[PDB]
């Protein structure tokens, strides 16, 4: 019986293998039908000999549906050519180089090949069931013979050396695609994908986003590390909750004005002065403005879903339209040009701040933010610090790093209690303020 | 005029004060009436000199109620027993140790006198109309005075020598309270104060929290840094939302289970190894279990609103329960006994993620998680990297810290790409891998 036959395996391995209601692709188990039949079965992480040790044990299970062989290293895939009642396999982070015995899975709809060296995909043209298939992390350049897997939904191909995409023209029902770190330029091939849902496109040399003005499905897209400047196109896809544009060349952020769902946005290293167009996106609960051109940040006062906010490398100097913030929890603004911080001390929820590299004298206003678990302030020109700031539950560090649960100094020119006592931490600097204050 | 008058006032001090909508207790300017008369006025951060300079010029303005002298380390406020219509002063940050000046303004409703050094406040007896009272950051013992302002809904006497808070009793309309850094051990007083929402008593001696009983409409409750075993008494407060019971004594949350509003959970370092009883908290969204002896962690999975989930520092083997947490986007697993992260594939918010100090060798299931910001993988058995370890918005560093914006290693026995390698950066990685694929 086919329980039987996992006794033999179990055997011939040296392991355990358990029942479960749905096969993962971590799964070092089975699953059975209610006739006790086997229609699953997980070997995840067993050795590289997996496949040849119990492939008859595997041709011998008639009902075998979905197998896999995941992170096993496995080089030889051959003898699974048998295995023709397959509708799900899992091979991924293996060591394969030749797909070719996988033509002869005609049942398959779930193909998983992340992370082997896979060059020529021809093998996969004849599987037009297929409706998920992952082929990221190989070596893959050409991918005409995809064009014919019509029923595909979910297909992943980030991190090979693909530059020609036109093969994905007319793979219409795909609502999953994932193309980063690739070598594409081209994208007007993907004009006609119209329910995509997901898009990312990361580490490309993408410049012409024209063609991802249809793709109106999108709520998800990342375009980061490209040399994008012009994100007009960008103004239709109203559906946007989340959107990645660092390392880009963008100056003009107005076609984003429109983009009311958008509830996380990066734009880290780009060229932005003007933020002005963020005014009116009130869903907005993660914003990353990290490493541009910001002076005035007016427009961000009204913005109060915001939760985390990255400021750090630019040139502000007036944080007072952050005070309105209520729900901000985590702020950094490293590296600016600010000398007063007394207006952050209204921001009742916050508990991270980052203040490091700036022009600060006095950080006695942050003594009223008893919410704070950590903050930052290596190289401001602090000299004294109020009694107060033994006040917070942190330990505090002299160190040139943040640290969350700490209170962090480095390079501050420290006088009243001097470094040599900050340096030896909360209990020290408690006692200095005690030996001077009971001999008042 | 009124104008005139602080003409006068700003060359008197040689200063700009500017017209403001609302004063703040930092605030360097003026509220006008309809009338075109002063009704506040904030000189924050002038010097010790400032009141005894321009009480005069204040003298004048009959229609003045908002003073704010914060921050000025002022030594006597003995002027401003002349004003007499003042129903708003604020006073922190300065070093006043005599407050008997203030007896004579009975109009008080708010006072601030947070940051001083002030240990008798007897004279605040007459105060009857405040409201809000501010006393955080000083030298109170004796807190008798306070038994007769019976208006008080806002107090504040944290950082202070108190150990008899029995004059609190009287005091029915409090809706707000801190007495957090205190010397108190007995809260029988406070069982009387029943419109309290919120209250704070951290780092204290309170081993019995059975007074706390009977404060039905308490939502935010801070308890940590204190030698409390029992937690039975909280039961009742069902109107709960935040809880911070860090660094206790306690073991059985089993009280916990019925308070179902609960959003924020704090119990760091107790003595917790069963959380069973978190199982029906399903509205908790930041959970803060580090430092106890947790391992088994099946009653996570079902709390599907957390965000943010801390569990440093236990006996955690099997990180599968966490697979369903959709909404999850920091995770902080450090010093366990992990050695497989397979599970943490479909973590699809995830962007926070620190590992360290754990028996991991294969990183690669964290490949496609596209939003990860900033992970930390210090001292695990990692020998080989994933090709994808450079496919991330995140930079590479080999320094003994975790940083959000990087991948961070340290103390890995790594070979594939050796540490000297990964300490040049993301690019050196990267070229590294791309010499093996074109010579292969």
Tied chains: 1, 2.
Excluded: H
Excluded at 169 to 193: F, G, M, R, V, Y
């Amino acid at each position: 019986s086919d329980l039987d036959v996992i006794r033999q395996i179990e055997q011939e391995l040296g392991m355990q293998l358990e029942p479960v209601d749905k096969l993962k692709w971590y799964s070092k188990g089975y699953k059975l039908d209610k006739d006790q039949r086997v229609t699953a079965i997980g070997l995840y992480d067993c050795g590289s000999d997996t496949l040849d040790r119990i492939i008859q044990p595997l041709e011998s299970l008639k009902s075998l549906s979905e197998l896999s062989l995941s992170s096993n290293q496995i080089t030889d895939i051959s003898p699974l050519a048998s295995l023709n009642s397959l509708s799900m396999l899992w091979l991924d982070r293996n060591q394969i180089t030749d797909i070719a015995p996988l033509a002869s899975l005609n049942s398959l709809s779930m193909l998983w090949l992340f992370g082997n060296k896979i060059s020529d995909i021809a093998p996969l043209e004849s599987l037009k069931s297929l409706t998920e298939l992952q082929l990221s992390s190989n070596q893959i350049t050409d991918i005409a013979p995809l064009a014919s897997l019509k029923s595909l939904t979910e297909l992943s191909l980030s991190g090979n050396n693909i530059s020609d995409i036109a093969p994905l023209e007319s793979l219409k029902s795909l609502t999953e695609l994932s193309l980063s770190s690739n070598q594409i330029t081209d994208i007007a091939p993907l004009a006609s994908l119209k329910s995509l849902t997901e898009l990312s496109l990361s580490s490309n040399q993408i410049s012409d986003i024209a063609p991802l003005e249809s793709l109106k499905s999108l709520t998800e897209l990342q375009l980061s590390r490209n040399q994008i400047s012009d994100i007009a196109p960008l103004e239709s896809l109203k559906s946007l909750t989340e959107l990645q544009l660092s390392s880009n060349q963008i100056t003009d952020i107005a076609p984003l004005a429109s983009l009311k769902s958008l509830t996380e946005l990066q734009l880290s290293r780009n060229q932005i002065s003007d933020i002005a167009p963020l005014e009116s996106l009130n869903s907005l609960s993660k914003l990353w403005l990290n490493g541009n051109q910001i002076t005035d940040i007016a427009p961000l006062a009204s913005l109060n879903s915001l939760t985390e906010l990255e400021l750090s490398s630019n040139q502000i100097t007036d944080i007072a339209p952050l005070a309105s913030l209520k729900s901000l929890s985590t702020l950094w603004l490293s590296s600016n040009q600010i000398s007063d911080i007394a207006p952050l001390a209204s921001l009742e929820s916050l508990s991270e701040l980052s203040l490091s590299s700036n022009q600060i004298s006095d950080i006695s206003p942050l003594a009223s933010l008893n919410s704070l678990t950590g903050f930052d302030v290596r190289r401001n020109p602090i000299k004294r610090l109020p009694e107060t700031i033994t006040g917070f539950d942190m330990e505090i560090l002299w160190n040139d790093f943040s640290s969350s649960g700490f209170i962090t100094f480095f390079d501050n020119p420290l006088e009243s209690p001097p470094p040599e006592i900050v340096k030896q931490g909360k209990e020290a600097v408690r006692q200095y303020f005690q030996s001077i204050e009971e001999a008042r």
